[PDB]
């Protein structure tokens, strides 16, 4: 439902159910959100702006782990947990219209939203990662539907 339909699925669903799908990307930072897709677009442009020392500052590499349970990202070098989000608390994931390599997802804290912003090591990877997040939403949904009689 407004999530990734099956013909766009990048993974055998088993890789989101019995395991996670793990990617690396640059982390640009997380931003608190007042509230469209304006939200993601606005936050993406701001977070990129914050990361420009112009040249870009040496932003950390994170490992993003995606399953039907939700999303975790940790520092790729240090391995410390930056955030673990249950999938129910994730509203959406989207690409930056201005830089298609950049992508974000939004979580529900409290009573405010946070937008977590990343830049893939490739534009192709930004598509694949967003598609994976999309698929994880749909797989979680399908598992939940079948759970209750």
């Amino acid at each position: 439902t407004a999530s990734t339909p099956v013909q766009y699925w990048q993974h055998h669903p088993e890789k989101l159910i019995f395991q996670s799908c793990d990617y690396k990307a640059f982390y640009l930072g997380s931003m608190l959100i007042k509230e469209g897709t304006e939200s993601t677009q606005d936050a993406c442009a701001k977070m990129r702006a914050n990361c420009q020392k112009s040249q870009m500052k040496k932003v950390p590499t994170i490992i993003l782990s995606v399953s039907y349970k939700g999303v975790k990202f940790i520092d790729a070098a240090n391995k410390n947990i930056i955030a673990e989000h249950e999938i129910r608390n994730i509203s959406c994931a989207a690409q930056d219209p201005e830089d298609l390599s950049t992508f974000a997802y939004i979580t529900k804290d409290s009573n405010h939203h946070y937008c977590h912003v990343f830049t893939a090591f490739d534009v192709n990877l930004a598509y694949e990662i967003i598609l994976t997040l999309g698929q994880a939403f749909e797989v979680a949904y399908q598992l939940a539907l079948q759970a209750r009689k």
Binding site: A2, S3, I87, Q95, D96, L133
Partner: peptide, 9 residues
């Protein structure tokens, strides 16, 4: 570009 909403939200 790509945008997906989570039905479980």
């Amino acid at each position: 570009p790509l945008s997906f909403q989570n039905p479980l939200f």
